[PDB]
């Protein structure tokens, strides 16, 4: 799992307000030029972006197998559900998962993903407290092959021979997938195209990595 994910935002105040309203004050902690949100076992720290930049990312959050429709209703309370092909939800056969989407104030593509066999069945109502963990984060890089190699050296599940430098590459198993790809292409459910912005993350296993502002994946 992702223990800590650090992202940048040009809209810190609006984002603070948005996530405090969505998740509750108990899940959000404000700092001077950053704040954190707790998503189950995962934390995201949003930091002030450099002037003249407007970073955004694609983040999917795991929810229970049996709570996709509740999650979808809940999400729609915070913004208009995104659509693709006139559909306001998606089914992904490869992940056997249902997904729904909204944009936050920075234009982040916030997905709720309900993995039908790779998530728990929770016999209990859905709420902000039932966001399980981070299920997806884009790793948008200036060198996909170099990135894949470093990730495998970091001992992450990478099938090097399958890596497509020009497309999206799913890295992981179970309930967490890093979306490794180049910039350029429009994200599903969004007007926005993949663009390199910096981030860093620490995994549950103690592995930590960074994407520099030029798109280099660097294993910290
Ligand atoms: Mn996704």
Taking the C-alpha atoms of residue 66 and residue 83, their distance in angstroms, rounded to an integer, is 22
Collapse the DSSP code of 25 into the 3-class scheme (helix H, G, I; strand E, B; otherwise coil) and give the result. Answer: helix
Task: Kindly state the tokens that stand for 176.
Answer: 């967490």
Distances (CA, A) of 14 to 29, 31, 46: 14, 14, 12
C-alpha of residue 111 to centroid of ligand 1, in Å: 6
Ligand 1 centre to CA of 140 (Å) is 13
Residue 127 alpha carbon to ligand 1 centre in Å: 21
Task: Give the list of residues 6+ apart from residue 181 with CB closer than 8 angstroms, or none.
Answer: 138, 139, 140, 141, 144, 167, 168, 169, 194
CA of 34 to the centre of ligand 1 (A): 25
DSSP state of 106: T
CATH class (in words) of the domain with range 1-220? alpha beta
CB contact at 8 A, 108 and 56: yes
What is the CA(109)–ligand 1 centre distance, in A?
Answer: 8
- Residue of 125, 137, 134, 13 lying closest to 74 (CA atoms): 125
* Resolution reading in Å: 1.8
The structure was resolved experimentally with X-ray
Q: Which residues of 160-178 are buried (b: 16+ CB within 10 A; e: fewer)?
A: eeebeeeebbbbbeebbbb
Pair type for strands 169-173 and 176-181: antiparallel
Q: Which helix (H) or strand (E) holds 101?
A: strand 97-103
**Distance in Å, CA 143 to ligand 1 centroid:** 21
174 Cβ contact partners less than 8 Å away, ≥ 6 residues apart: 118
User: Under a CB-based contact definition with an 8 Å cutoff, are residues 8 and 56 in contact?
Assistant: no
Give CA–CA dist 151/30, Å, rounded: 32
Tell me, in angstroms, the distance from the centre of ligand 1 to residue 108's CA: 12
**25 CA from centroid of ligand 1 (Å):** 27
């Amino acid at each position: 799992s992702i223990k800590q994910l650090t992202l940048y935002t040009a809209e810190l105040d609006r984002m603070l307000a948005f996530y405090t309203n969505m998740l509750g004050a108990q899940h959000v902690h404000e700092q001077a030029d950053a704040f954190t949100i707790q998503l189950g076992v995962s934390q995201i720290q949003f930091r002030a972006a450099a002037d003249g930049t407007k970073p955004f990312y694609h983040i999917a959050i795991n929810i229970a197998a049996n709570h996709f429709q509740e999650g979808k209703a809940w999400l729609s309370g915070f913004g208009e559900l995104l659509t693709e092909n006139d559909e306001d939800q998606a089914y992904f056969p490869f992940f056997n998962a249902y997904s729904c989407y909204v944009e936050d104030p920075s234009g982040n593509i916030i997905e709720l993903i309900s993995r039908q066999q790779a998530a728990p069945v929770l016999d209990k109502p859905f709420s902000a407290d039932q966001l399980l963990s981070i299920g997806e984060i884009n790793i948008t890089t200036s060198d996909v092959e170099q990135a894949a190699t470093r990730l495998k050296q970091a001992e992450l599940p990478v099938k090097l021979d399958q890596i497509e430098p020009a497309g999206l590459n799913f890295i992981g198993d179970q309930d967490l997938f890093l979306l490794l790809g180049p910039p350029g292409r429009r994200w599903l459910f969004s007007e926005r195209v993949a663009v390199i912005y910096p981030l860093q993350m620490e995994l549950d296993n103690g592995v930590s990595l960074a994407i520099t502002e030029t798109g280099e994946l660097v294993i910290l």
